[PDB]
Amino acid sequence: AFTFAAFCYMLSLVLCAALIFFAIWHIIAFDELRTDFVHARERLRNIERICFLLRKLVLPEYSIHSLFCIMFLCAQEWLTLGLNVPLLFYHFWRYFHCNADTLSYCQKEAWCKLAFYLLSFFYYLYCMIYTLVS
């Protein structure tokens, strides 16, 4: 009772762990930036550090989500993939789509994305469960 989809699902939820972690961390970063919005030099250094971390935490999202999609494809699964695809659409949209005003939208963006990733974690665990015994 392995099916090659159980491995993919468990790997997917493993990665979703740090996905949730980074989503919460970005939420906290946006919250502290909202609070913020030589003490000025200190705030500048802090925001530079946080923005550096953010820009460093961009490629992994793309990478692991594309991995999710490609592994779901290579496993002949066709009910979860279709749910991860819209996120890939949004990702590729972000390039030619996209501080004091931008955070207003980034907040809800990160919130909805965290909700999506949590729901996906639960769904992947359920799939692995009712697929690992048959």
């Binding site: 392995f2 090659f4 491995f7 468990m10 790997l11 493993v14 762990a17 740090a18 972690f21 802090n46 550090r49 971390l53």
Partner: protein
């Protein structure tokens, strides 16, 4: 001539293929047929290879003590001789004359020959002992620690010899594992944990039953021994009914009960089935008890001594074994007695991988939440 009474049971009494197209002794065949042939040769006479009426070997009635079966014939004059697999008993001999056993036998066991066991989720460790696995693990971590202690405890001439000896070690380990696994996968030796009835007495996973009415059942009820008494206790206190009503019933049960049943019966019938189709059974251990099929003859007769002597003559002439090999093994169909590798054999490897992976991931997450927290707050 002579009145030869017997019963239809293979490979003793078998009807020739064209039995309807024939009328005479040529109809029948098997072991006891050639036996009676050689017996008449020794003595010299005519015989009519008749059959019993009720299709029973022999017994009596608790109230009317009427002998039903070949016993009733040889006692009530209906027959003159009974060349059949007639079991020898105290009661049956108290009335008639039994010749020396021509076929010694005893109760035995019948099971389904070992089939390829479950993939053994953690089977990839079977080639080696768990101790060796733990030693590999602890050696790896100890070597990593030592490497850690030649960089902070010292700024190499140490990493060189350490790397070389570790290379030697992992080399030999890889080689040993590969060789042992190849040996395992090439020959594919099969064994069952049941080499006797003592084993069945110890364990209780696989069941075992007997014909609900027969000499075997009574013997098991009787025979107050630490083992057989325990097995009777089990089969009496056990559900569902391990017993059966016939033989083929128990055979098909074992067949469909591949790995959890075993039928006890005469060793002769077991050796016979094991050579018949579908060649998916086997006998193990040895004869629990010891009985003997011998000729029978009325109390007062004239062939008693002649037959008793011919029996020994044949047993010494290497003839009974000849007929047995003929009707059991030469006639036997089971004269005879690579694959890919499924995932189930290695699933534990991927489980371990995912485990270590999530572990390293959580470690990294907490290390990050500590490092960044300290660097920002301080």
């Amino acid at each position: 001539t002579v009145v030869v009474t017997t019963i239809l049971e293979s490979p003793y009494v078998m009807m020739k293929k064209n039995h309807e197209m024939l009328e005479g002794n040529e109809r029948y065949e098997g072991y006891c047929v050639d036996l009676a042939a050689e017996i008449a040769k020794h003595c010299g006479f005519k015989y009519k290879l008749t059959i019993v009426g009720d299709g029973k070997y022999g017994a009596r009635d608790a109230d009317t003590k009427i002998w039903n079966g070949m016993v009733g014939e040889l006692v009530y004059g209906k027959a003159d001789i009974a060349i059949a697999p007639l079991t020898i008993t105290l009661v049956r001999e108290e009335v008639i004359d039994f010749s020396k056993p021509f076929m010694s036998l005893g109760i035995s066991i019948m099971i389904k020959k070992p089939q390829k066991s479950k993939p053994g989720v953690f089977s990839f460790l079977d080639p080696l002992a768990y101790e060796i696995w733990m030693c590999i693990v602890f050696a790896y971590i100890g070597v990593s620690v030592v490497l850690f202690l030649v960089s902070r405890f010292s700024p190499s001439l140490s990493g060189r010899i350490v790397g070389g000896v570790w290379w030697f070690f992992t080399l030999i380990i890889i080689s040993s594992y590969t060789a042992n696994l190849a040996a395992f996968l090439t020959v594919e030796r099969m064994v069952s944990p049941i080499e006797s009835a003592e084993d069945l007495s110890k364990q209780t996973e696989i069941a075992y039953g007997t014909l609900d009415s027969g000499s075997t059942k009574e013997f098991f009820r009787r025979s107050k021994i630490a083992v057989f008494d325990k097995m009777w206790t089990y089969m009496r206190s056990a559900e569902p009914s391990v017993f059966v009503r016939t033989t083929a019933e128990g055979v098909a049960r074992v067949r469909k009960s591949k790995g959890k049943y075993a039928y006890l019966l005469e060793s002769t019938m077991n050796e016979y089935i094991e050579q018949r189709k579908p060649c998916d059974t086997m006998k193990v251990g040895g004869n629990l008890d010891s009985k003997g099929y011998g000729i029978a003859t009325p109390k007062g007769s004239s062939l008693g001594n002649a037959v008793n002597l011919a029996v020994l003559k044949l047993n010494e002439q290497g003839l009974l074994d000849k007929l047995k090999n003929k009707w059991w093994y030469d006639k036997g169909e089971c004269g005879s007695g690579t694959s890919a590798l499924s995932l189930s054999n290695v699933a534990g490897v991927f489980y371990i991988l995912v485990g270590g992976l999530g572990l390293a991931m959580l470690v990294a997450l907490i290390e990050f939440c500590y490092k960044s927290r300290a660097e920002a707050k301080r």
